[PDB]
Amino acid sequence: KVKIAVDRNPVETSFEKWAKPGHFSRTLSKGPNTTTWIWNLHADAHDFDSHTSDLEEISRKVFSAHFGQLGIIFIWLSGMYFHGARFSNYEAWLSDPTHIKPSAQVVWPIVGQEILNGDVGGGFQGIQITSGFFQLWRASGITSELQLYTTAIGGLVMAAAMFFAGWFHYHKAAPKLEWFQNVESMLNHHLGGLLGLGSLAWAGHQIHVSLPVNKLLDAGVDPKEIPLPHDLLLNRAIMADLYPSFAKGIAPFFTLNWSEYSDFLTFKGGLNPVTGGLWLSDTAHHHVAIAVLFLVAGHMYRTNWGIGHSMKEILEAHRGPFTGEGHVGLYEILTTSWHAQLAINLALFGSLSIIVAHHMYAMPPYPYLATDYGTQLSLFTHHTWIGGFCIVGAGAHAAIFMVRDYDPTNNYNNLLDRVIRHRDAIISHLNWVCIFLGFHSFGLYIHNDTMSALGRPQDMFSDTAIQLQPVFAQWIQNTHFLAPQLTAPNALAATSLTWGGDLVAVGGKVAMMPISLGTSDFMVHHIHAFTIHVTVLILLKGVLFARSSRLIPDKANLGFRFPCDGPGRGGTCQVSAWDHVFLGLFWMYNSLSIVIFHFSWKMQSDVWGTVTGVSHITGGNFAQSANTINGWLRDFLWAQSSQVIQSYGSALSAYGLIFLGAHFVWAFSLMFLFSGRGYWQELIESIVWAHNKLKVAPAIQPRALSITQGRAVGVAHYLLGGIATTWSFFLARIISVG
């Protein structure tokens, strides 16, 4: 029986526990004796497993926490809309998108920082934004600042509702454990109601507001002169003036004569040629199809009536001869362990974000987006980074499950058990394939460097010497370009210009052209494969050996996060799964930095540029230069950092400052990464003596950071430094040459 189950008034709303730091932990509620306490207080603040053993209380805590997160995000969205309405040039940009730079941040005139308010056009001065909100707002049909202001107030109201919902569902009416364990009902409601009704209501908004307003905006009529959306809902005769299908109403829908809705539910493909974005009619049909699909999908699992599937029965039904008991026991694991769920959801959520990056660069969904090169670079890079971080998190929480929640006396000869039982074979094969990939992928680059340096270019791996053509990718590309003719008859064009074909340009700039693939693309793709495989190796090794290894047979009893097991047995530093997350973080940074460099150079070289033929931003140097390390060093890094290094005295000077600052923070991380806390503790001893001499020794004893906190501080400053460096480089480059 699926029903609402709630306990009344569990936790009194009181300011008492605000005044007692570390109340949540029996160890930390004793008070601070040394400085380590503070760090512990913040590190274990949200580790609810270390607070209680009771799954119900933990579940309630995570529920209200999620509400807090949603309220924060709503505050953030409210801020973006309010700043877009009050401190922007959005209307001016609407009147001239091709020659006005999107700006929605202005600085105050103090200490000379006023110079950052640059000439972005439209009679405005501010910081040019690259988040892409302007294109999203134009695509949604927003025309005035008033509507943005109203959206800001609405989002603030929703933030207040989310914080009230958090307080309410923790302190007043907090759900019971068997409410949270209704996973079949949760999937039904989220697949129907969330994704399904979400895309249904959005398709409603599109068909009724987006399509007419953007059709008029593409027609050329002044935005203020375009009818307001409520007049588009109210008087259907205007909707019939743009698309005569609307004259017949919803009569073709119920009578199944859906073909008459082909005015606004299309299958054109390609891009809008005057606008450089996907057709909103294609997007409307897409969201209608997505809606119907998800609402069908949301009626799959049995709840309070006989019909519907059961998750444990589907899992226990798939058993073979090679795997033994198969998927038995997995339902119990995924309905009692939050960390397993978090690992799965983080992996797929990160992967999904990377897919979002690729599909949004390749098939520009917003108008005047493809030619806002800064926005495209920013969006791709951003969502790729977010993706990578969520994948590393997935590996982390997988390992946390493996140490804290794994219990083999309910999990005995299972898929998980066999994985743990042949982990040596898995890791050794992954090891070998990583070394193989490293040798041949990186070795081609080193080979080319040597041959080019020795004056023998005919012996290189290139398009003119020893060729290594991406035959398979070229074949898939050609097939997808020829797809509208035979295997997709109702498609007018291909799904993306990059497959092949003509060229769509807007305002003299290239929106998208066919992307060619040669030896350089072969080499970078195998570099990507190598780095990804190594990252998977580290993380997977971390999760498979989290409990035990031949080195530490009882590693599980030492916890998930611990520094080592002493200098014996040769040395056991970084044996914990946490340390494997730490190394996977560095390798994830490596991989995604090479990925975004690939994207940046390739787009600036073979795609972007002006139309007179097409003059590219870097003239097409990718195909001959991206085969040597010196080529990346000179033609990419050195050449394209001109803009960042000479940005002083202009509006881009902040990117130079953050270039230097990011380099500094990156180097600053090396002190934590390369050293150890014994030295620092002894140094602190001397300093403590000096403070004792002058009666200024604190009652809370100064302690050097822990080993694991030294590693954490190290990797955090390392990531912040490197990522912010590439951020400043990218933004200054693409804003100046864009």
Binding site: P21, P109, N692, K695
Partner: protein, 165 residues
């Protein structure tokens, strides 16, 4: 003058840099309307630029061969040639405020060590006692030299040391 440096009111590269910055600001200015907000902001920027160059030439700063103000850090040379307001008066101003902060922190520590929970007062600040010591710390150099002369500024050799001392 000092070290072969010309005064900034006499330096030519100083006036050249002033004219160059005004030229950059008016090249940014000449692409707007007359009474618009970017025009008002850039005219306020030009006003502050002219006022800043007039104030630096007024104060008797020394410029080099590039037209930039140079500072003199020697007490007697700066007191002799009238450059005491750039290092000497700033260094005694800094020593006043830095010793203020240090003396207020030291008095807070000695005030909270004499209780049953010194660490609990270190985490959660006694705000009235902190404000009382913050207002009383204006006579910190007098109280500092008095604690120096009584021998109560220093702890004796009851300090913590290592076995080879």
């Amino acid at each position: 003058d000092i070290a072969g440096l010309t005064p900034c009111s006499e330096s030519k590269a100083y006036a050249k840099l002033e004219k160059k910055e005004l030229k950059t600001l008016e090249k940014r200015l000449k692409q707007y309307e007359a009474d618009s907000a970017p025009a008002v902001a850039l005219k306020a920027t030009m006003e502050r630029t002219k006022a800043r160059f007039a104030n630096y030439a007024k104060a008797g700063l020394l410029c080099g061969n590039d037209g930039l103000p140079h500072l003199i850090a020697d007490p007697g040379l700066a007191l002799k040639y009238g450059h005491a307001g750039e290092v000497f008066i700033p260094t005694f101003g800094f020593l006043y405020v830095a010793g203020y902060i240090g003396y207020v922190g030291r008095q807070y520590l000695i005030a909270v060590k004499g209780e049953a929970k010194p660490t609990d007062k270190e985490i959660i600040i006694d705000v009235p006692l902190a404000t009382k010591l913050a207002w009383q710390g204006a006579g910190w150099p007098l109280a500092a030299v008095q604690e120096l002369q009584r021998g109560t500024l220093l702890e004796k050799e009851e300090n913590i040391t290592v076995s080879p001392r």
